[PDB]
Amino acid sequence: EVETFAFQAEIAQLMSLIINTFYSNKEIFLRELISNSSDALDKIRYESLTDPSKLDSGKELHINLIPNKQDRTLTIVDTGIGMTKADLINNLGTIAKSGTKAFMEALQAGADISMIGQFGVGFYSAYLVAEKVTVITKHNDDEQYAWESSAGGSFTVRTDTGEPMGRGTKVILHLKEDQTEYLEERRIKEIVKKHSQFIGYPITLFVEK
């Protein structure tokens, strides 16, 4: 049972700007997703201080980076707080509306796409390098869901029948044909060292078989 939704016009406009604008410094997508993971880990850690049972779904707080050349995917996995169905369908897009408008205004005033995270909509920089994004997520208060979009104005949400995650989020980047450098170990190491060196959680870069 797959549900198809329309993006709000403003978010669809943001996605088209990310896809269509000429902008060579694409590597910042990884910093933006890792920053999102770190924020989600901060949240579950803070909540667990006053309710230890929130970690019954997993005590480990970490980030895994998993390249797969066979699938041409880069997956960013965290064990953070995860997202609810309402987050996926409405809450996060609602918040992103104001950040998008401010980001668009800043771009016309001289900012560049690398500053997208200062407006709270860094997730959408995934479309700098990905033709399709699949997000698997599990929040303590909700079921496991798969969100997916190839842009074009729509996204889908379904209950995920796959391997249970416990708690957290998996962002699966189906990379564009000319963006496979982000599957190379040395390239990912370089980018993590450059932009994510002080993240307060272990980042494990998986090796390919």
Ligand X SMILES: N#Cc1ccccc1-n1ccnc1
Annotated binding site for ATP: 36, 78, 97, 123
**Binding string to ligand X for residues 18 to 37, with x set by CB under 6 A, is what?**
------------------x-
Residue 92 within binding range of ligand X, rule CB under 6 A:
yes
Range 139-178, binding ligand X (CB under 6 A): 147, 169, 171
Residue from 74, 135, 136, 188 binding ligand X (CB under 6 A)? 135
Kindly provide the b/e burial profile for residues 29-53, where b requires at least 16 CB atoms within 10 angstroms of the residue's own CB.
Answer: bbbbbbbbbbebbeebbeebeeeee
The window from 88-96, 172-180, 187-195, 201-209 that contacts ligand X (CB under 6 A) reads 88-96
**Could you tell me the smallest distance in angstroms from the CB atom of residue 121 to ligand X?**
6
Please calculate the CA angle 18-21-24 and round it to the nearest 5 degrees.
95
CA 76 to chain centre: 7
Query: Which residue number, 57 or 156, has a Cβ lying nearer to ligand X?
Result: 156
**Could you tell me the smallest distance in angstroms from the CB atom of residue 146 to ligand X?**
10
Strand partners, 76: 65, 171
Q: Do β-strands 63-68 and 203-205 pair in parallel, antiparallel, or remain unpaired?
A: parallel
